[PDB]
Write a sequence for this structure.
């Protein structure tokens, strides 16, 4: 992966056109997104008052 | 260069016509056989037409005779890693009441896992159990459903090419040149067709040479680093785990990616062992440094010395000491070919101006012949003892060929003819004799050895005592007188020495 919607990600020597690529992503509050492939999730209820 | 071992098996076997107005040919089909030749020779195939006086030839060039094997199968084995994940979803429904998979549900993907990718590959999605309570993540004393998916990856992308074989039949290279002008090369096998090029189906024959340490060997090679090795490899898809033969795929394009549709794995290639909602996967796939002895390019097992010969469609070779095999003849087949014949040959005459070489030995005696004619390559030399045919050019040039002689002083009169006109030539010169070279350290055999002339192994009385005399009676008398004088002097010296040793002790 070199560029995502006109955003520089890595340093490559040959560019091309955008291509559909299935990949997961998540936001943490920064500008750009973070894509990941190997991740372990855990669902906790905690009986919070927000639910 | 030179040529020998003529056949002329199907002379005058054409059914042509006027030839498009002036002269042409239609077809020349038959069957012939070429005997064994030494590495670095040419086997000419001269045709004879009933109408045309002369025709062209077909030279067969052999450079190396290496010990290779056949190609039973071909596949690529990529490198794999250990990747896995897990989840800790709560039941919260009637899905994880007692058991997560009712009887056979293995597709544990609720449209959320990362398995639907092009870089993941394929694997086995299992399930596990969890605990209950405030510390376990839920609010019910009941086990939870924990699903896990494991898959292999290949970050680097090392590609290997393995080709199992258990024949190891002799083979060689052939640089064939057609009489029309096309020159190509191909690698024939011991009894296997060599992709016949417009009728010519010359094959190579062996002598059923025995082996000593060739039982389970393959030709596994590497593509990126171009590293070779010799080690017992696996068999076709039906294999056993414990040695080479890990997850394969269809082709080289399917080797960088471990996706499905071409990749085949049997069972028990990746282990999983979880303790508490972790699902950590350990590696059990053996690397390259886990197989048996795993010989490399430098191999000296027995008399065979396996090397890496730079060649197409094959990178495995090897050459033991001089074997001097019995027969290595070929089998040339004909299906269809034509050659343009002019039938307009005119007067031509040549002569001999140089003669040199060895005795009846490996390289032979090279004799250069000079000719002059108006056509391009209308010539055919025939003489007693040996027959040699070659090609010339238009005009006057120099051409060097080699012949086989069985006499020290080569002084005879051969007949030379270029097409239809014939003439006479003569040879006069001095030749030498060279024996079979010996073995020396630092030098190893490259391809093979065919044969060495070791029949006579005796000095001929005619050639000997020739340069010492030249007159012969005078020389013999002088040598005898000198020998007698030297013998008398040495006897007198010995008598004086014995007299000095006896007395004055
Ligand atoms: C190489 O394989 C094993 C590895 O130790 C060894 O015992 C054997 O003698 C070697 N040669 C073979 C199998 O030809
Ligand atoms: C014959 O061979 C010798 C040795 O190379 C060479 O000097 C001489 O020119 C040759 N003669 C002809 C006629 O080719
Ligand atoms: C003879 O050989 C020369 C080599 O260049 C070739 O050009 C020519 O066409 C050939 N045939 C002739 C001269 O009839």
């Amino acid at each position: 992966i070199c560029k995502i919607d006109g955003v520089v990600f890595n340093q490559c020597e040959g560019e091309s056109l955008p291509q559909p690529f299935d990949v997961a992503w998540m936001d943490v509050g920064h500008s750009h997104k973070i894509i990941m492939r190997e991740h372990k999730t855990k669902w906790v209820q905690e009986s919070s008052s927000k639910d | 260069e030179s040529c020998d071992e003529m056949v002329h098996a199907d002379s005058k076997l054409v059914s042509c016509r006027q030839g498009s107005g002036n002269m042409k040919e239609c077809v020349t089909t038959g069957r012939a056989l070429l005997p064994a030749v030494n590495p670095g020779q040419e086997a000419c195939l001269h045709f004879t037409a009933p109408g045309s006086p002369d025709s062209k030839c077909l030279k067969i060039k052999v450079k190396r005779i290496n010990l290779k094997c056949k190609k039973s199968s071909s596949y690529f084995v990529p490198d794999a890693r250990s990747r896995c994940t897990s989840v800790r979803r709560c039941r919260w429904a009637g899905d994880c009441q007692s058991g997560c998979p009712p009887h056979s549900t293995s597709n544990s993907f609720s449209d959320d896992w990362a398995g639907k990718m092009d870089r993941a590959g394929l694997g086995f999605s299992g399930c596990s159990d969890g605990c209950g309570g405030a510390a376990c993540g839920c609010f019910n004393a009941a086990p939870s459903c924990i699903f896990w998916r494991k898959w292999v990856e290949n970050p680097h992308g090392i590609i290997w090419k393995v080709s199992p074989c258990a024949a190891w039949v002799p083979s060689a290279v052939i640089e064939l040149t057609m009489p029309s002008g096309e020159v190509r090369t191909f690698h024939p096998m011991s009894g296997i067709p060599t992709q016949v090029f417009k009728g010519v189906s010359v094959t190579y024959l062996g002598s059923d040479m025995e082996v000593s340490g060739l039982t389970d060997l393959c030709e596994i090679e590497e593509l990126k680093s171009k590293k070779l090795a010799l080690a017992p490899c696996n068999q076709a898809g039906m294999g056993v785990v414990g040695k080479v033969g890990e997850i394969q795929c269809s082709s080289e394009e399917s080797a960088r990616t471990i996706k499905k549709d071409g990749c085949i794995w049997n069972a028990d290639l990746v282990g999983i062992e979880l303790r508490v909602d972790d699902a950590v996967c350990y590696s059990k796939i053996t690397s390259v440094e886990a197989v048996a002895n795993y010989s490399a390019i430098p191999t000296t097992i027995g008399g065979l010395r396996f090397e890496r010969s730079h060649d197409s469609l094959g990178k495995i070779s090897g050459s033991p000491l001089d074997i001097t095999a019995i027969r290595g003849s070929f089998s040339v087949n004909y299906r269809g070919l034509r050659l343009s014949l002019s039938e307009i040959t005119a007067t031509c005459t040549g002569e001999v101006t140089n003669v040199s070489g060895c005795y009846s030995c490996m390289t032979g005696a090279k004799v250069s012949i000079k000719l002059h004619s108006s056509k391009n390559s209308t010539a055919h030399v025939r003489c007693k003892g040996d027959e040699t045919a070659f090609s010339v050019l238009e005009g006057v040039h120099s051409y060097t060929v080699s012949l086989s002689f069985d006499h020290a002083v080569v002084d005879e009169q051969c007949q030379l003819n270029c097409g239809g006109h014939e003439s006479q030539v003569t040879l006069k010169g001095n030749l030498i004799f060279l024996d079979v070279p010996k073995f020396v350290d630092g030098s190893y055999m490259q391809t093979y050895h065919s044969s060495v002339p070791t029949g006579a192994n005796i000095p001929s009385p005619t050639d000997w005592l020739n340069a010492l005399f030249g007159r012969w009676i005078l020389g013999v008398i002088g040598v005898l007188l000198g020998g007698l004088a030297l013998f008398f002097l040495i006897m007198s010296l010995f008598k004086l020495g014995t007299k000095q040793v006896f007395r004055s002790r």
About this structure: Residues B 213, 215, 292-293 surround 2-acetamido-2-deoxy-beta-D-glucopyranose (ligand 1) (CB under 6 Å). The CA atoms of residues 7 and 32 of chain A lie 9 Å apart. The beta strands of chain A are 24-26, 34-36.
